[PDB]
Design an enzyme around this catalytic site. Sequence first.
Site, PDB file in Angstrom:
ATOM      1  N   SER A 117       4.127   3.563   8.429  1.00  0.00           N
ATOM      2  CA  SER A 117       3.510   2.790   7.377  1.00  0.00           C
ATOM      3  C   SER A 117       4.582   1.953   6.681  1.00  0.00           C
ATOM      4  O   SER A 117       5.616   2.457   6.284  1.00  0.00           O
ATOM      5  CB  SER A 117       2.814   3.715   6.388  1.00  0.00           C
ATOM      6  OG  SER A 117       1.554   3.188   6.019  1.00  0.00           O
TER       7      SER A 117
ATOM      8  N   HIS B 272       0.806  -1.233   0.000  1.00  0.00           N
ATOM      9  CA  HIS B 272       0.000   0.000   0.000  1.00  0.00           C
ATOM     10  C   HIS B 272       0.844   1.291   0.000  1.00  0.00           C
ATOM     11  O   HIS B 272       0.396   2.368  -0.426  1.00  0.00           O
ATOM     12  CB  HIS B 272      -0.982  -0.008   1.178  1.00  0.00           C
ATOM     13  CG  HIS B 272      -0.450   0.626   2.432  1.00  0.00           C
ATOM     14  ND1 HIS B 272       0.291  -0.068   3.366  1.00  0.00           N
ATOM     15  CD2 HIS B 272      -0.567   1.888   2.913  1.00  0.00           C
ATOM     16  CE1 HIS B 272       0.604   0.738   4.366  1.00  0.00           C
ATOM     17  NE2 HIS B 272       0.095   1.931   4.115  1.00  0.00           N
TER      18      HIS B 272
ATOM     19  N   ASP C 172      -0.588  -6.953   2.125  1.00  0.00           N
ATOM     20  CA  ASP C 172      -0.024  -5.617   1.993  1.00  0.00           C
ATOM     21  C   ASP C 172       1.498  -5.636   2.060  1.00  0.00           C
ATOM     22  O   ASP C 172       2.065  -5.071   2.987  1.00  0.00           O
ATOM     23  CB  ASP C 172      -0.569  -4.792   3.175  1.00  0.00           C
ATOM     24  CG  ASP C 172      -0.234  -3.316   3.088  1.00  0.00           C
ATOM     25  OD1 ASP C 172       0.892  -2.973   2.678  1.00  0.00           O
ATOM     26  OD2 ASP C 172      -1.102  -2.493   3.456  1.00  0.00           O
TER      27      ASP C 172
END
Length: 539
Positions: free
Chosen positions: A485, A323, A379
């Site tokens: 992230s 992502h 992901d």
Amino acid sequence: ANTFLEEVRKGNLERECVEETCSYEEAFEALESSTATDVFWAKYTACETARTPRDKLAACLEGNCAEGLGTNYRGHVNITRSGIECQLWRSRYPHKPEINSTTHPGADLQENFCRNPDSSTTGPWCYTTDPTVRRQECSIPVCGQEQCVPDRGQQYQGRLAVTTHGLPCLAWASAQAKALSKHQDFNSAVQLVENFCRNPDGDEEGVWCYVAGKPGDFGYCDLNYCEEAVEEETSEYQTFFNPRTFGSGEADCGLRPLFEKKSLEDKTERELLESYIDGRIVEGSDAEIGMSPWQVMLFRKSPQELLCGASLISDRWVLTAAHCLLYPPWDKNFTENDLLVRIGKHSRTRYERNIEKISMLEKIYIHPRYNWRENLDRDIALMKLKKPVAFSDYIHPVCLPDRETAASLLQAGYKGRVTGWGNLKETWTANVGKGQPSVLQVVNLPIVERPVCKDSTRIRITDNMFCAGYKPDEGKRGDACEGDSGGPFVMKSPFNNRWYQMGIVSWGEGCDRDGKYGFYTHVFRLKKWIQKVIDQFGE
Ligand SMILES: *[C@@H]1O[C@H](CO)[C@@H](O)[C@H](O)[C@H]1NC(C)=O
Ligand SMILES: *[C@@H]1O[C@H](CO)[C@@H](O)[C@H](O)[C@H]1NC(C)=O
Ligand SMILES: *[C@@H]1O[C@H](CO)[C@@H](O)[C@H](O)[C@H]1NC(C)=O
Ligand SMILES: [Ca+2]
Ligand SMILES: [Ca+2]
Ligand SMILES: [Ca+2]
Ligand SMILES: [Ca+2]
Ligand SMILES: [Ca+2]
């Protein structure tokens, strides 16, 4: 089948062609007419993507569930995916059909039952009475959805020949897949048949097969794996990957240069050994220097901008989240030339020119079974740098665990470490508390029980994700949205002092309601994938 005698007996479609697979003449003997038919050898041959018990064929052949994207279907679902009344095939209101019951008389196009004449890659569908909606896919329960293929399908015998991404598995057969991909050899119990998906090298992510494009290209075929969680499951470190494509750094990972090499202990690493004790609740703090030396930043070129965290597993290779690199919802399609890694920084901004190295990537591998349309499933992303990064006390790679090893850890550790410059709060919320942190913070968190984290969410947890964070109460409060992230979640082993990365920070529902957790992508599954992606090299 024809086990010697039994051909005194009259043909039986069930015993012979349904309980056993079969041939043309066995079929004929059983049949009364030589209708070698069309959608009836297809009643067979479109049903071959099914091959499990007495039922999966009977269910398939008596057109009640869809086969793959199943133009076998002959059921009665007069409705849509949303739930729009189906328009009759015979009709032209609201929509005058292009495909009537003559264009496609192979298919059972009558009344208003979902059929798949043209073969939608969305499969069985129908015409819609909602005059703004021409056609639409129908929600049919698929064959033996209640079956559950286990052991990532080591056992699997059936015959799928295309991947999630719908590519045709080349046959293991070839002069390159056999006699130039001979370099890697497999578990010989697993019968490789033509080009049907198999799991020879015991991969943890499911079956696969080689594909077209670059040499050694490949992908994982879609099958409905059982829910085999590691959390429900050595004396020191033996090396896993080939150091000609990995780079060196492996046989010596996870031993920190300014700690585990100096017999020095870091400021909260005690808290991690002593994982059982009902600790006070230690918050985040400016990390020590060189405390997480596998730390990677992922910098957008122009403008300057910090996208995500990532981690370093060797001199070449850098691990992050899918992502982070690719997200159609935020219209996101970054590529090898837009991106730079800052390896082993400490400040969020300053240029630590004595210290950090910055790099360009030589190719970015987004993960094969990565999909967001539902829910950021798998992901994961892998990146190779344009040149080995030279180590030191500031840069030095982490260890990626097998399953057996992650399995070991979660048995003994009940906390892990999350570090970063809090990029997850930065990307996924307005970050309206005190602003972004000035240095690489560090914190420790508890791992939650699989059930807790499951019934702690309206969303769904595959056997491939995991949750972290204390469970919010009036002093046992919870900030979950920690880390970067696409960053690391590491645990340290008390068997070899080494630091493993257990997970990859993904999006947390625990970034919105005060009451949730951070979700993480288990890295134990990854090895063999990485195993194949590296091997596609030599230099
Ligand atoms: C579909 O048609 C059948 C005809 O018997 C009926 O039983 C069913 O209720 C119908 N459903 C819809 C949504 O039209
Ligand atoms: C079926 O639809 C076609 C598509 O245009 C149409 O022209 C034709 O009239 C229909 N077929 C028959 C045999 O009437
Ligand atoms: C993103 O952009 C590249 C380069 O322009 C293009 O080839 C590709 O279609 C896009 N990739 C994906 C995965 O959407
Ligand atoms: Ca028989
Ligand atoms: Ca027989
Ligand atoms: Ca027979
Ligand atoms: Ca038999
Ligand atoms: Ca016979």
